[PDB]
Nucleic acid binder design. Structure first.
Lengths: 155, 261, 207
RNA sequence: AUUCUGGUUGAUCCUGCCAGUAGUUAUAUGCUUGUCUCAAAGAUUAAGCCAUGCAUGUCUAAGUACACACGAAUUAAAAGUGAAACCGCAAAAGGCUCAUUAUAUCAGUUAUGGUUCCUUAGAUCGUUACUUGGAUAACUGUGGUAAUUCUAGAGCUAAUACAUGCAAUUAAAACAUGAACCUUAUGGGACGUGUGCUUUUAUUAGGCUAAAACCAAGCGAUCGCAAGAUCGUUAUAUUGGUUGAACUCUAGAUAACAUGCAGAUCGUAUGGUCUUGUACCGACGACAGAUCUUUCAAAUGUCUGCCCUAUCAACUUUUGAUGGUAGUAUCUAGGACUACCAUGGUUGCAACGGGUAACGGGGAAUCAGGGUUCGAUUCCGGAGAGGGAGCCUGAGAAACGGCUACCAC
RNA sequence: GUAUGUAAGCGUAUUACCGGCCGGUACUAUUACUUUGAACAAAUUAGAGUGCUUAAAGCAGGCUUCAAAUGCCUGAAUAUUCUGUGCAUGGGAUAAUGAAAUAAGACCUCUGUUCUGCU
RNA sequence: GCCCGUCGCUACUACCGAUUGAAUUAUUUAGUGAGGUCUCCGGACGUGAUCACUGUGACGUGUUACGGUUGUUUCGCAAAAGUUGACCGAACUUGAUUAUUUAGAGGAAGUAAAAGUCGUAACAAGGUUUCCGUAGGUGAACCUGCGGAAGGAUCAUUA
RNA sequence: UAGUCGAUAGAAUAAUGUAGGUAAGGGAAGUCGGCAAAUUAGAUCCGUAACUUCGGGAUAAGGAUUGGCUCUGAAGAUUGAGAUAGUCGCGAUUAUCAAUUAACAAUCAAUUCAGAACUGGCACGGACUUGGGGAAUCCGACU
């Protein structure tokens, strides 16, 4: 992406790598501890390997993704570190004794751990600490990102 | 931050388990902010006046409770609006009746007369155990009592016998799925026994599946499940018929049957 | 007055948010402390529930920490060099969260001569000799111990090249990570590995 | 009770609406109205405007009495009771109304690792005046403006107001870095500052499968007179932790920080023991108090839903629109706000706009059911208090039966 | 003599342990829908218990007993409207979706091959 | 027999319309901008601690302490009126905009029409079948022209 | 720069003039008539109607801003580096390769358009240049 090059030096609160005085070394070069997303939700391994600062990320940030787990389809991948999902469902109105198909279009934060997020991906989103006005969610799993043909590379 | 508390509780907005009669009064007794949560708490005002008929009015309740005759869990309880909810021992020293507030199968409080030696203690479900405040671990009960330095095997949703005269833990029953239970509000309220299993749903609302001694099985959330005992022997005296929950019709058959007048 | 509430300013539909609530004191926000570089004043503010959160106006001093050495000392805040948020803040010398601060460096250095006896940068023949208390700390002796301790230390003692330049120049790069507007004190991380490398590029480009 | 019946014609059959017809806690109005129980009721329109009165004030044995208010008499009596006034707490809402207001409010559904919580309930404070200091009300006296009231001036006097800070205010202990001592260092230390809770920053211990062959400082054991050289069974590389975790979580260590707390209280009732200093030390709960929980709460956030309208089709980005980053604000996340940087966000699944006798829901009316209509109002939540804006106090009000301002009255 | 609806067998998703078929663990196409649970504010609505003297309904009161007496006592249920939704669970019909035919196709297994990586 | 419009009376309703009418509302640019708060100050006043001059005591005239509505030189903490810069911003003015209301010479409709005036248009082939689209002309009806349909007067016969 | 300084002059510098200006407060009341005079003017930005032959109306209307100094950014031209090897004494001679590459870097050019402070007494198109505007009507289409 960017080499986390913003006007400020991007640092995570409470991790300064201590060169000087404290017992030496077994490789990895990084004090980066990484998550178990645990509603049996498996981590993407780029969390552990992530140079990316993202303080609004649950993998690199001091945030809980708290509450409602919903599954939806990405309609717009356009934004740097957030995506739009449209969820479309039947709401049964008893009066009309038929439904109306109805939509809610909601912005949801894509941490840059999640790569090949493209419209039309089915994505598992969790309500998040409500992150920037229309962004009230964060992606807990990209369950699609996909390409059932594309997973194994076509000749 | 904002607004209240707003101290006025209207009758009809008032928790139904109290059995406040609609007429005569727009206004409910509103138990002041104590150790027991407002909906789950039986004000001294209702208990003395409506049930025990020692007091006719609200003005009579303040006269008795000011006399310091109503000594809820080791304490004088000067306040007639004192909440006094669950497992609390109300001792009317002259003349001596000794009560525990425990639950009817109809999810109402009962007048339950306990032995003066049963009145010494009480059973406390443990909300939370946290580490740091003096002298370093502390346990807090559902009746807001903090008991310092708890036995290290006491884990959240366990019960402790509390000595009351001193605030000490003098027994603990681990939340293990064949321990005797009374459930405290869900709709299943004061039904009893014996917790077949729990199904843990991580975040949130862990559901406990409970089998009463009529072998009827029913389910409540873990926050509603209070552990009171061992399968067969409850540590406190249960109110009659031992929260079995028949049907209203089966109760009607038994009731109608029980009189030759 | 100054109001949080999400309910001001156009929707994502661009829909005109009408009114509903005057401005409530539930929504309260209050004028920025804008804390300056200088003579130690701290004022109490009554904050919701009761609690005093301190607005500092004019703070000389901070707690600037060497993370790698695990030691932080109280030092004078000489200057504000850079601010990523506003250039005006640099000029006015206001102490902010991540405002880049040039310290003062003298009490740090005395103690690291007293941990390594390696003068960090390589000082000078009259400067070493002149003990207020430089040379006394260097030589020490007592046979024996504290000299023995300096022998144990130093596969580590080389001290990063960037830092050694900064150390003897007497002005050390840092970022303040406290809000002295609500936390009443101005206190920072001293820029070590990665932290220096990004900022140092910004120094030499911007000037 | 899934109901029709009258009316186009000369007569006749449908299409059709209209009338009749029944109900309406659904409002008006007429006439008539003996009795009983029950009660909605200035909503619609005028969320118009208001004379006069009242709805928010408050004292116990328990903060403060030198009220001559009453009680005083015999010993130093003030003490008792308690208006006033200080002090503390309430006044943030009950109540009223439903205007603005159409996803907004709000219900159900939920979250808070995004936060605050007086109070109450329960627990917590051993790191040289011990009970000191002086100023003011009430008071006394003298005044001001036509005035409510606002207070000027002079002279007192209290504190659970204020100002300090000792004789239980106490250091010891142990660990850090200083070190007398010893020896090569498996290594440990007298005496020391510092080390209370807290506030504030940084760093760290944190969530850890089993065995071997060597080397350097040797811990036992062995080989060698030594010098020297080998090997090794075992404890062990060990804050946890909600759990989406590198949480700053309830809490700590190391390095630094600032500054509150730890009662110069009061009322009950006085004992033990005299070297009788008026000594030492002592129970309850009232009001403080600091940490922590709990409780009354709360603000924001999730999911899903609302009438009519296209004779409203593109909309948001002047100046945040929508996103990144960093800051600031705040009780809190947060474009809430600001710099910089991207070009996004919303839309025929009707967006944006306009209208609404449009607060929402719980509910009500009317029914064969299905529905249609209603809700301004007896509850719950939110909102407002002539329209608007700004603010103090306080745990909490952007308050109006608070203030300050403007504009209208 | 049937009937088979119910139960257990047998043919690439009931396979595999541990503890004595049971009960976990390891488990597994997305949905819409639907099933069963919890979670559904009271009033209202339906309605239980009950002579508010009838009744609207109130939530009283009845009893041995108008004796002597707190003695015996049932109570102020249950459902649904607070829809849909969400949570949890079951089904695999209906309607869609799914690998892999330009096979870097699915397993498995051999290279200690590779890279990450340890108390 | 049905029967319509033009024309004329009267009554009622809505439209267009000079006035670039009028009124009120909510958004809006720009300008102006009360007040509060935050913030830079100010020092009305009031003391400490120190110094003196006087009185007193202590100590070796001097010093120190205390007092004297005391005076004066150092340097502090609080502190009013006023006030600096900022941000919120009521309010006002003027353009723009929108919703809603309503005056109006006059024009031009429709209706109630009900005793009228002029025609016979259509209803029978209504004496010119009807009726449509469209143009022009007729007092009007309507006629006419061009292309149609049958809802015709041909459901047709007619090598 | 080149060419003039000849327009008969001096003193007074009256009225009245001519030619050039200014004038409080009110602001067209003036007059045949806004004639004369004044406002306005450039630029950049924002905003922009009736009506319409859709081209215009339009510089509509209505608003904002302009100096100086001090910085910053953007906008071009040209070859060069870098790495390795052999020969002779870092210097000289010879051989190889594409990536490097949005200023690659380096250097040279010459000004444009934008943004930010500081700054003065609103002073900022400062001289000069240089539309007053809108609403209707009569008339000829127009130059």
């Amino acid at each position: 992406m960017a080499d986390q090059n913003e006007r400020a030096f991007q640092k995570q609160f409470g991790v300064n790598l201590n060169r000087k005085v404290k017992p030496g070394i077994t490789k990895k070069k990084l004090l980066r501890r990484s998550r178990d997303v645990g509603l049996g939700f498996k981590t993407p391994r780029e969390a552990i390997d992530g140079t990316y600062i993202d303080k609004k990320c649950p993998w690199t940030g001091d945030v809980r993704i708290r509450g409602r787990i919903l599954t939806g389809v990405v309609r717009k991948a356009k934004m740097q570190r957030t995506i739009v999902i449209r969820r479309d469902y039947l709401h049964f109105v008893r009066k009309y004794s038929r439904f109306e198909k109805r939509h809610r279009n909601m912005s949801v934060h894509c941490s840059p751990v999640f790569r090949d997020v493209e419209h039309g991906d089915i994505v598992t989103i969790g309500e998040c600490r409500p992150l920037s006005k229309t962004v009230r969610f964060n992606v807990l799993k990209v369950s699609k990102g996909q390409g059932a043909k594309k997973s194994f590379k076509k000749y | 931050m904002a607004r209240g508390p707003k101290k006025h509780l209207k009758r009809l907005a008032a928790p139904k388990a109290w059995m406040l009669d609609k007429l005569g009064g727009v206004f409910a007794p509103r138990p002041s902010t104590g150790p027991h949560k407002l909906r789950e708490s039986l004000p001294l005002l209702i208990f003395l006046r409506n049930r025990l008929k020692y007091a006719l009015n609200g003005a009579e309740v303040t006269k008795i409770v000011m006399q310091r005759l109503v000594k809820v869990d080791g304490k004088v309880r000067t306040d007639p609006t004192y909440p006094a909810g669950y497992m609390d021992v109300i001792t009317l020293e002259k003349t001596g009746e000794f009560f525990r507030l425990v639950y009817d199968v109809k999810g109402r409080f009962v007048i339950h007369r306990i032995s003066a030696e049963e009145a010494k203690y009480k059973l406390c479900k443990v909300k939370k155990t946290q580490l740091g405040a003096k002298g370093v671990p502390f346990l807090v009960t559902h009746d807001g009592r903090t008991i310092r330095y708890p036995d290290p095997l006491i884990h959240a949703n366990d019960s402790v016998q509390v000595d009351i005269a001193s605030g000490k833990i003098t027994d603990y029953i681990k939340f293990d799925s064949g321990n005797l239970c009374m459930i405290t509000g869900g709709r299943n309220l004061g039904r009893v026994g014996t917790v077949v299993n729990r199904e843990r749903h991580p975040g949130s609302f862990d559901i406990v599946h409970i089998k009463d001694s009529q072998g009827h099985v029913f389910a409540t959330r873990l926050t509603n499940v209070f552990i009171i005992g061992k399968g067969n022997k409850p540590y406190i005296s249960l109110p009659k018929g031992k929260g079995v929950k028949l049907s209203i019709a089966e109760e009607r058959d038994k009731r109608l049957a029980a009189k030759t007048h | 007055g100054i109001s949080r509430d999400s309910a001001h300013k156009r929707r994502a539909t661009g829909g005109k948010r009408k009114s509903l609530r005057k401005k409530r004191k539930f929504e309260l926000g209050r004028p920025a402390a804008n804390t300056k570089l200088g003579s130690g004043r701290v004022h109490k503010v009554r904050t919701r529930g009761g609690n005093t959160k301190l607005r500092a106006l004019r703070l000389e001093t901070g707690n600037f920490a060497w993370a790698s050495e695990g030691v932080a000392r109280k030092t004078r805040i000489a200057d504000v060099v850079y601010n990523a948020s506003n250039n005006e803040l640099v000029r006015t010398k206001t102490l902010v969260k991540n405002s880049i601060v040039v310290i003062d460096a003298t009490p740090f250095r005395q103690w690291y001569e007293a941990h390594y006896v390696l003068p960090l940068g390589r000082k000078r023949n009259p400067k070493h000799a002149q003990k207020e208390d430089e040379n006394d700390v260097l030589t020490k002796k007592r046979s024996e111990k504290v000299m023995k301790k300096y022998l144990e230390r130093q596969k580590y003692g080389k001290v990063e090249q960037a830092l050694e330049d900064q150390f003897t120049s007497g002005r050390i790069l840092a970022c303040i990570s406290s809000r002295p507007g609500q936390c009443g004190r101005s206190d920072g991380y001293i820029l070590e590995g990665k932290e220096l490398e990004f900022y140092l590029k910004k120094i030499k480009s911007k000037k």
